[PDB]
Amino acid sequence: VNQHLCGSHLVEALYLVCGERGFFYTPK
Amino acid sequence: GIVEQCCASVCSLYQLENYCN
Ligand SMILES: [Cu+2]
Known about the structure:
Chain B: It comes from Bos taurus (Bovine). By secondary structure, chain A is mainly alpha-helical. Chain A has one helix at residues 8-18.
């Protein structure tokens, strides 16, 4: 399902999705 | 980009996978 994700809620979602792979958080 | 799109618009968890290492 589609997501409305701002601020810290976006990095939680990144953490969940990527897990041990890790991720980059790169705003504009 | 993703940070803006997810917040200003909406995004999918599949779109988020593009940001995994
Ligand atoms: Cu909140």
